[PDB]
Amino acid sequence: ARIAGINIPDHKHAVIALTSIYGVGKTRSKAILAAAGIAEDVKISELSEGQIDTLRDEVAKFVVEGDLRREISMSIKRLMDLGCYRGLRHRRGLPVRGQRTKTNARTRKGPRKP
Amino acid sequence: RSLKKGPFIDLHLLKKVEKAVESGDKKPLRTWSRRSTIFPNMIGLTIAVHNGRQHVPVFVTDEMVGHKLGEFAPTRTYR
Amino acid sequence: AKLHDYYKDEVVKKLMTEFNYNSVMQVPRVEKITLNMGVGEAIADKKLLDNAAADLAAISGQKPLITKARKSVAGFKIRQGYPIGCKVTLRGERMWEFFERLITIAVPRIRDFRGLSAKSFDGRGNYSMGVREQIIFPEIDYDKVDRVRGLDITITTTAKSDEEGRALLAAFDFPFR
RNA sequence: CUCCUAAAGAGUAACGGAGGAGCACGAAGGUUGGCUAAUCCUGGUCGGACAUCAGGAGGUUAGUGCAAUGGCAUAAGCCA
RNA sequence: ACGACCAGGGCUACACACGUGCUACAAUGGCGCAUACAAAGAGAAGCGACCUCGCGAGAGCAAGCGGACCUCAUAAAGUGCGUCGUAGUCCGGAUUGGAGUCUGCAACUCGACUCCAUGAAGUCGGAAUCGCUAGUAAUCGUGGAUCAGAAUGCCACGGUG
């Protein structure tokens, strides 16, 4: 159905359906299903509404939703406004973690332009 | 990414910072220790960090604590 | 007429002293809620505009009014008289039964809610805000969604200034960031 | 065909100064009922200088199947 | 001084072009649990078990081993069961944010690794072009040199074939 994470997860195995939330991967999905009491191989259908309310109550413990997007934007903005090395690498769309820029920077640089 | 057994700072820079804060506002601190960590008692001072040829003036703010000094002095020129 | 009844008994006498009005007729009112859906891209195909207006028909229970282009402009390459968007104005209790339907259901649904702005006033006491998603309403089901088109909502009040305007919706517990 | 030359009735020439027409429409005709612009400002999902929405300013600076002139709110303009 | 010492920086840049590789685009596959079968090597400022703590990288304690004895060291493809059911997906892992570990005087430029989160391109590749004839190609792991740390490279080893 729908979760406190607005997003609407698909009707499939709960462990994989909960991954559709921004901020919930496989490990956090397994942890949510374990702390809630729901099996991992059960679909989102066949789940009572009282069980979805339980899943919401558990996902409320994590910062996983536009809130997390806001915290990531805040960190990158702090880096850019600080003017440090990583801030400059973020400003110019260049790799931040020491990767080579002579070749192979296509994820940060995008499609090549002559 | 240094262990959690305490941050690193060069001793000469540490003593320079204590002498600068105990003696009131001073001139920029000329240093070559780009690897030193910015500590909270350096907030307010402007440290001139070497970048290879010059000493780049860096006015320290509370948002810089935890960074290394060389993070605010680029070493390569690109236009 | 929940907030409608809540209007004539509660928010009038707190406002009557808040601005020290001499007559009850001086208190601001809420005339109409008009929902606009500017399609813009219906010129490519008009099969999508009818179902677009079908959504707006389900949000308020009123058959929408298809607006036409007032004049030809090539900047968006339309000739005057083309079906460009639909709209619905709501008055009376159908406005009220909708006015609570969002403030108590339309508020707690928007993704990454941060609260409404207090600066989005016309300057003479009328509020307007736009919702980006249409799946925020209970009526429109997520299963049946061909597009994610939003819509604008403006609040027409008899208030004379924004201060009297913001004071009225604040009495209805409006989220003001 | 329209304006000016044309000398405040009409008319008035030049290889004088400027523009148009050789159609369109069974509704763009008749009638009854209703309606009132341009532009700009402010606010507002995508939406931008410019789309649709709301409000204020403004008062016909708009509109009139087409040139110009004279008209047009009782609208001759717009809708059924 | 074109000699010598030092600190910091650079050799790691980045519109772009090429060579050589690794990982993929998936179902002859991904994931989960269970389980089978190697060879060749290295080790004393070294390899470091067992046990305890940690989600993990690792940490503490502390045997044995100059080694057919001890350690690295659990081979992996495979096989059994379950699931996914052709979707940019339970494919793919880039990139980025946060939190850490270890080496090292010191991980900013500019280390490796771990955890959480995110989830680019990519759905088999134009012209053209390469290797390979049998335990070969293809594919799957393992070890060593250099080395404080830093292998998708190099050199070697076996499994299926």
Swiss-Prot record, chain A:
NCBIfam families this protein is in? uS13_bact (TIGR03631)
Coiled-coil features, chain-numbered ranges:
none
Family to which this protein belongs: Belongs to the universal ribosomal protein uS13 family.
**What is the protein name for this chain?**
Small ribosomal subunit protein uS13
The outcome of changing N104K is: In PW097; partially suppresses a rimM deletion
Query: GO terms for biological process?
Result: cytoplasmic translation
Gene Ontology CC entries for this record: cytoplasm; cytosol; cytosolic small ribosomal subunit; small ribosomal subunit
Tell me the GO molecular function terms: rRNA binding; structural constituent of ribosome; tRNA binding
Q: Briefly state the protein's biological role.
A: Located at the top of the head of the 30S subunit, it contacts several helices of the 16S rRNA. In the E.coli 70S ribosome in the initiation state was modeled to contact the 23S rRNA (bridge B1a) and protein L5 of the 50S subunit (bridge B1b), connecting the 2 subunits; bridge B1a is broken in the model with bound EF-G, while the protein-protein contacts between S13 and L5 in B1b change. The 23S rRNA contact site in bridge B1a is modeled to differ in different ribosomal states, contacting alternately S13 or S19. In the two 3.5 angstroms resolved ribosome structures the contacts between L5, S13 and S19 bridge B1b are different, confirming the dynamic nature of this interaction.
Q: State the superkingdom.
A: Bacteria
Q: InterPro entries annotated for this entry? A: Rbsml_uS13_C, Ribosomal_uS13, Ribosomal_uS13-like_H2TH, Ribosomal_uS13_bac-type, Ribosomal_uS13_CS
The UniProt entry, under PROSITE patterns, shows:
RIBOSOMAL_S13_1, RIBOSOMAL_S13_2
Query: Where is the segment annotated Disordered?
Result: 93-114
Q: Which UniProt keywords apply?
A: Ribonucleoprotein, Ribosomal protein, RNA-binding, rRNA-binding, tRNA-binding
Instruction: Please describe the quaternary structure of this protein.
Output: Part of the 30S ribosomal subunit. Forms a loose heterodimer with protein S19. Cross-links to the P site tRNA and weakly to the A site tRNA. Forms two bridges to the 50S subunit in the 70S ribosome, contacting the 16S rRNA and proteins S19 and L5.
Per the UniProt record, the lineage of the source organism begins with: Bacteria, Pseudomonadati, Pseudomonadota, Gammaproteobacteria, Enterobacterales
Return the PANTHER family for the record. Answer: 30S RIBOSOMAL PROTEIN S13/40S RIBOSOMAL PROTEIN S18, SMALL RIBOSOMAL SUBUNIT PROTEIN US13M
Q: Name one Pfam family in it.
A: Ribosomal_S13
UniProtKB/Swiss-Prot annotation, chain B:
Checking Gene3D superfamilies in the record gives: 30s Ribosomal Protein S19, Chain A (3.30.860.10)
Q: Which GO terms describe its biological process?
A: cytoplasmic translation; ribosomal small subunit assembly
Please provide one cellular component term from the Gene Ontology annotations of this protein. cytosolic small ribosomal subunit
Which superkingdom heads the taxonomic lineage of this protein's source?
Answer: Bacteria
SUPFAM superfamilies attached here? Ribosomal protein S19 (SSF54570)
Q: Which keywords annotate this record?
A: Ribonucleoprotein, Ribosomal protein, RNA-binding, rRNA-binding, tRNA-binding
Name the InterPro entries on file: Ribosomal_uS19, Ribosomal_uS19_bac-type, Ribosomal_uS19_CS, Ribosomal_uS19_SF
Tell me one GO molecular function of this protein.
rRNA binding
Query: Which residue ranges does UniProt annotate as crossing the membrane?
Result: none
Q: What does this protein do?
A: In the E.coli 70S ribosome in the initiation state it has been modeled to contact the 23S rRNA of the 50S subunit forming part of bridge B1a; this bridge is broken in the model with bound EF-G. The 23S rRNA contact site in bridge B1a is modeled to differ in different ribosomal states, contacting alternately S13 or S19. In the 3.5 angstroms resolved ribosome structures the contacts between L5, S13 and S19 bridge B1b are different, confirming the dynamic nature of this interaction. Bridge B1a is not visible in the crystallized ribosomes due to 23S rRNA disorder.
Q: Kindly state the subunit structure of this protein.
A: Part of the 30S ribosomal subunit. Binds S13 and L5 and cross-links to the A site tRNA.
NCBIfam families listed in its UniProt record: rpsS_bact
Recorded family membership: Belongs to the universal ribosomal protein uS19 family.
PANTHER family in alphabetical order: RIBOSOMAL PROTEIN S19P FAMILY MEMBER, SMALL RIBOSOMAL SUBUNIT PROTEIN US19M
Q: Could you tell me what this protein is called?
A: Small ribosomal subunit protein uS19
Native source species: Escherichia coli (strain K12)
Taxonomic lineage of the native organism: Bacteria, Pseudomonadati, Pseudomonadota, Gammaproteobacteria, Enterobacterales
UniProtKB/Swiss-Prot annotation, chain C:
- SUPFAM superfamilies membership: RL5-like (SSF55282)
Pfam family, any one = Ribosomal_L5
Q: Which InterPro entries match?
A: Ribosomal_uL5, Ribosomal_uL5_bac-type, Ribosomal_uL5_C, Ribosomal_uL5_CS, Ribosomal_uL5_dom_sf, Ribosomal_uL5_N
Where N6-acetyllysine occurs, residue numbers? K2
Has UniProt tagged this entry with the keyword Ribonucleoprotein?
Answer: yes
Question: Listed GO cellular component terms?
Answer: cytoplasm; cytosol; cytosolic large ribosomal subunit
- Name any one GO molecular function: 5S rRNA binding
Q: Which GO terms describe its biological process?
A: cytoplasmic translation; ribosomal large subunit assembly; translation
From which domain of life does this come? Bacteria
Q: Which UniProt keywords apply?
A: Acetylation, Ribonucleoprotein, Ribosomal protein, RNA-binding, rRNA-binding, tRNA-binding
What protein family does this chain belong to?
Belongs to the universal ribosomal protein uL5 family.
Its UniProt miscellaneous note says: Identified as a multicopy suppressor of the slow growth phenotype of an rsgA (yjeQ) deletion mutant.
On subunit structure and binding partners, the annotation says:
Part of the 50S ribosomal subunit; part of the 5S rRNA/L5/L18/L25 subcomplex. Contacts the 5S rRNA; cross-links to the P site tRNA. Forms a bridge to the 30S subunit in the 70S ribosome, contacting protein S13 and S19.
NCBIfam families for this protein:
PRK00010.1
Q: Its biological function?
A: This is one of the proteins that bind and probably mediate the attachment of the 5S RNA into the large ribosomal subunit, where it forms part of the central protuberance. Its 5S rRNA binding is significantly enhanced in the presence of L18.
Q: This protein is called what? A: Large ribosomal subunit protein uL5
